[PDB]
Amino acid sequence: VRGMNTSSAMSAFERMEEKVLMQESRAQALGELAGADLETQFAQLEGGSDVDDELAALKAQMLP
Amino acid sequence: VRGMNTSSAMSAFERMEEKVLMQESRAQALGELAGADLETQFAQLEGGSDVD
């Protein structure tokens, strides 16, 4: 209950936490860098820009 | 996505670019020199003069 150093439950939680924390932190940092880059930033805008013109075109296409 | 040094896609693009850039630059420079020479310059005029 106290949680001895040698206890299996206490040791397992600490080991699991260290592995989980490192993996999560590394992935997020790498992901942020990709997001930070300018190429990713206007690509989303381009996609957003592309769909609206297509939608207008689509309406014209579906009109007849 | 980030483009690691060891990644195959990043390495391939860099290697391809270096080979392509060198070949293109060398050919253009050599071509310019041939164009620069006087013999080539009036030859075109001669052809133009000859056809009319």
């Binding site: - | 896609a9 693009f13 391809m16 392509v20 070949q23 293109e24 060398r26 050599l30």
Partner: protein
Amino acid sequence: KASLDTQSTQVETLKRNLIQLESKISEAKTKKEMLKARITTAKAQEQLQGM
């Protein structure tokens, strides 16, 4: 439920990342054909230019 929500968000992000990767590989295939054509022209031109 709390664990599921956090996990689901991560999964969604991974799916989005895969789509971006798919766009990139397709572009690379097109590039190889273009690169080869450029290389061939340069090689032929260089030999001709020297002569």
